[PDB]
Ligand binder design. Structure first.
Ligand SMILES: COCCCNc1cc(Cl)ncn1
Ligand SMILES: COCCCNc1cc(Cl)ncn1
Lengths: 300, 237
């Protein structure tokens, strides 16, 4: 179990760690988060009390280094940093826990929610999507645009997600225009799976990463990416059976975790009705359809 | 974006453009079978592709053989239309290719956009105008070439005959849409108006009769009356 210590908490802030969150008051005796499960990526995220604008945060994996949070009064944000001096990292942390000023990652032992939301996400792959190579952790915020949004403006600060565009020459084989547009199997299986992603594991990892950025930061381009990746599968007549079964589980846990009061802005009515009720896979997502109909029957 | 009454004169500027109407591509007669069920029999159809500035009509005849063994023919018809329009554009010299294609039905947008991905600079647009091009098969010479076709065929017509020698393309288009609106509202009456007088003939290389300027004014007035008439007969006004 790993620890993300804090220098101090000079400004009042709501702190998120994965699907959990808590409030820290200005200058409150707070030394960070302990007992973080090893083996999963994690996200630590922030919303300042005085400006709920800009949710922001950091994806990290404690196996990839010793990380601490330090408030920068010039840039006005809580920054993740790496302590290379392991000895010194170990030296600074022990005092805080004898002194008890850390919040404990509060995992219920029955609870596989975070595993189920991050099963295919890889921290080294996240660095490929969020380009800032000098750090082992990746910063994301509410305002960051995707490469596809920048084609329709700073490149260094963008979310490099796999570009998906159903009316593109990549998606449509010459001479199969109707076929490829009405059944996207070629685009899913040959172009995307075999060609770009390499396997479905990678496809699920980006799809899961896109959802979590939409949910935790209200990142609109990430929401667009999540829905496009769902729709590409649902609009394919030929999908490996194990991919459909896994997608059903992935979406079930995403819909289950979604805050009830954010469903209006995080769920695209057209895509979900099409996917559940008109698409090739309309009968293939039993768990997702059941939770959707019982939790958000308005959207449908 | 969409074409409507506010940007109507754009049709007659010097940017090449084509209307595409797919109404008459997939045509059927519905009939009873010996067992008393209903079946369809396809008949030949046509794509109506029109340059509104020059009157050039690219009439692609759709022979019933293109439907043989195919499913969901109403959906296929939109994609076949888009395929044939794309083929037409590719067949034209670059300087003759359209800068915009205006489809008369919104269901043609995605099929045509997909077939024209190779042409990112050609704008594919809908329209809010209710154009009466479905009535093209009420023009006898167009109907004849469609129904006589034994194979796929493209035939080029000028739908304005020689009118542009005497009137502008705005006025020619207005005349054409009035004629076609009348033929759509009451085909028999419209055709009686157009042919009642046997001393005015249709030249072999024309579609419509050789009306003088003064005769066109009379004809045009009679078509307006017909349309207003039928509108009363229809709504009892
Ligand atoms: C400016 O901080 C001096 C020590 C930097 N390394 C750290 C900081 C913290 Cl909170 N925990 C562990 N290592
Ligand atoms: C442009 O993205 C192509 C690679 C995406 N594969 C991933 C992404 C994530 Cl977060 N986790 C695992 N695999």
């Amino acid at each position: 179990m790993n620890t993300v210590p804090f220098t101090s908490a000079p400004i009042e802030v709501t702190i998120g760690i994965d699907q959990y969150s808590f409030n820290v008051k200005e200058n409150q005796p707070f030394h960070g988060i302990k007992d973080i499960p090893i083996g999963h990526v994690h996200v630590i995220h922030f919303q300042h009390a005085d400006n709920s604008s800009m949710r922001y945060g950091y994806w990290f994996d404690c196996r990839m280094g010793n990380f601490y949070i330090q408030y920068d009064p010039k840039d006005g944000l809580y920054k993740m940093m790496e302590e290379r001096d392991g000895a010194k990292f170990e030296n600074i942390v022990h005092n805080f826990k004898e002194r008890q000023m850390m919040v404990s990652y509060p995992k219920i032992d029955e609870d596989d929610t975070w595993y189920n939301l991050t099963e295919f996400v890889q921290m080294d792959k996240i660095r490929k999507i969020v380009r800032k190579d000098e750090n082992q952790f990746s910063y994301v915020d509410s305002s960051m645009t995707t490469v596809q949004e920048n084609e329709l403006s700073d490149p260094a600060h963008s979310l490099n997600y796999t570009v998906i565009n159903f009316k593109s020459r990549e998606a449509i084989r010459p001479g199969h225009e109707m076929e490829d547009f009405l059944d996207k199997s070629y685009y899913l299986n040959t172009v995307m799976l075999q060609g770009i992603f390499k396997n479905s594991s990678n496809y699920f990892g980006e799809l899961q990463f896109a959802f979590l950025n939409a949910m935790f930061f209200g990142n609109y381009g990430s929401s667009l990416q999540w829905h496009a990746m769902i729709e590409l599968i649902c609009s394919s007549a030929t999908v490996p059976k194990h991919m459909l079964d896994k997608l059903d589980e992935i979406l079930y846990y995403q819909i289950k975790t979604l805050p009830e009061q954010y469903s209006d802005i995080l769920l695209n009515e057209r895509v979900w009705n099409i996917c559940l009720y008109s698409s090739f896979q309309k009968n293939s997502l039993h768990n997702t359809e059941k939770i959707m109909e019982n939790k958000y029957p308005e959207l449908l | 974006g969409a074409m409507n009454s506010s940007n109507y004169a754009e049709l007659f500027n010097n940017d090449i453009k084509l209307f595409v109407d797919d109404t008459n591509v997939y045509r059927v007669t519905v009939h009873k079978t010996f067992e008393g069920n209903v079946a369809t029999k396809a008949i030949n159809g046509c794509i109506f592709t029109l340059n509104p500035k020059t009157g050039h009509l690219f009439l692609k005849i759709i022979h019933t053989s293109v439907w043989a063994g195919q499913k969901r023919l109403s959906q296929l018809a939109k994609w076949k239309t888009a395929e044939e329009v794309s083929a037409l554009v590719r067949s034209l010299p670059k300087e003759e290719q359209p800068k915009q294609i205006i489809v008369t039905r919104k269901a043609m947008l995605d099929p045509l956009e997909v077939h024209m991905l190779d042409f990112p600079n050609i704008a594919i647009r809908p329209t809010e105008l209710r154009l009466p091009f479905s009535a093209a098969m009420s023009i006898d010479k167009l109907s004849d070439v469609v129904m006589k076709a034994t194979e796929p065929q493209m035939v080029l017509f000028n739908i304005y005959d020689d009118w542009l020698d005497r009137i502008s393309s705005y006025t020619a288009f207005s005349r054409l849409t009035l004629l076609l609106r009348a033929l759509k509202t009451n085909e028999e009456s419209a055709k009686m108006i157009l042919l009642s007088d046997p001393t005015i003939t249709i030249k072999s290389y024309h579609l419509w009769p050789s009306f003088t300027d003064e005769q066109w004014i009379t004809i045009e007035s009679q078509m307006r009356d017909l349309i207003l008439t039928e509108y009363g007969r229809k709504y009892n006004v």
